């Protein structure tokens, strides 16, 4: 009928189709569906994929190339993963397919965030395992996660390459200050420029604004004049044009969920405060997507302290927002 509510699923669009799997709510989501919404009719479709079908996964980061898909990491039922799948979506009943990757992969971890570039997917952040050896960056441990769990676990601002010519993993040499070790942060690719906004890091949801230049590897810090939005994480950053970002959502420091809208231009440095009418609807860990005709498209997420599991309210609603 219509899909059942969710949060930390993924969400990916040609600008015309919206690919949903994945996700939690109050156990996780069925791992063989993948739902398909329509941006131009608003209709729903259920379809059940075979394969190397991933395990249903909260946190995972999933790209559009060509209409195939990517999906990577993610957690699930016994921890997190650093596995790497693939789902073309052209075609016949759609076969994933777990790619066996050459190099030394990313920590597994969930919570990221990716930049797409030509022949290059790059990954940048995100919460999991310390690394199985030394890898360029830093990772940062979460004290509670210690006593909670059997494997603890940290933050890291690791910068990754999947080149989809060869499937090869590798990291650049960066240079530049690169952004603090964080997870639940947002992703952003305009042009070659590969934009991140806030997240967590330590006690802090953070509000700093960067972007690795994706031709030299050399990150910059954008410090907009005037008035900025709160810091926040689980929120979603989009392109709507070639120079727009759009922001939504998200939980603050003070762990209050938010409403508020917003673009960046890149062009003038600064940010705009978007009027919307779903002030009434704060989600967070939600998915966007932007369509051909200018709109940006949330689903799911959860619309309060979603870390009070038993009073959490995930949503399945589609909140459109016109720009
Ligand atoms: C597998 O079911 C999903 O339910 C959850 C939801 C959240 C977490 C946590 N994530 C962190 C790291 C982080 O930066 N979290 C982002 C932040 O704190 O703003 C600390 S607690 C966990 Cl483990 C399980």
Redesign the pocket.
């Known amino acids: 009928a219509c899909p059942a509510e969710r949060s930390?699923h993924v969400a990916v669009s040609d600008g015309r189709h919206m690919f949903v799997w994945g996700g939690?709510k109050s156990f996780y989501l069925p791992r063989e569906e993948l739902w398909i919404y329509n941006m131009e009719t608003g209709r729903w479709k259920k379809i059940n994929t075979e394969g190397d079908v991933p395990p249903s996964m909260?946190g995972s980061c999933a790209v559009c190339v060509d209409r195939v898909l990517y999906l990577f990491g993610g957690?699930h039922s016994r921890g997190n993963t650093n596995k790497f799948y693939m789902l073309d979506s052209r075609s016949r009943v759609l076969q994933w397919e777990r790619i066996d990757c050459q190099g030394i992969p990313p920590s597994s971890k969930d919570?990221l965030g990716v930049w797409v570039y030509k022949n290059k997917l790059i990954f940048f952040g995100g919460?999991g395992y310390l690394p199985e050896d030394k890898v360029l960056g830093t990772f940062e441990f979460?004290e509670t996660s210690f006593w909670n769990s059997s494997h603890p676990r940290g933050?890291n601002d690791h910068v990754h390459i999947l080149d989809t010519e060869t499937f090869t993993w590798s990291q650049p040499i960066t240079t530049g200050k690169a952004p603090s070790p964080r997870?639940?942060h947002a992703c952003a690719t305009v042009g070659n420029r590969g934009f991140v906004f806030g997240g967590?890091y330590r006690d802090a949801?953070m509000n700093d604004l960067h972007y690795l230049n994706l031709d030299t590897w050399e990150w910059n810090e954008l410090i907009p004049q005037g008035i900025c939005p709160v810091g926040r994480?689980?929120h979603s950053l989009t392109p709507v044009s070639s120079d727009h970002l759009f922001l939504f959502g998200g939980?603050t420091t003070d762990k209050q969920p938010l409403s508020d809208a917003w673009t960046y231009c890149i062009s003038k440095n600064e940010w705009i405060q978007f009027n919307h009418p779903y002030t009434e609807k704060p989600r967070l860990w939600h998915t966007a997507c932007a369509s051909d005709e200018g709109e940006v498209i949330v689903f799911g997420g959860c619309a309060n302290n979603?870390?009070v599991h038993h009073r959490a309210a995930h949503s399945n609603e589609i909140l459109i927002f016109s720009v």
């Open positions: 930390g939690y909260s957690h919570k919460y979460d933050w997870a639940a967590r949801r994480s689980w939980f979603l870390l």
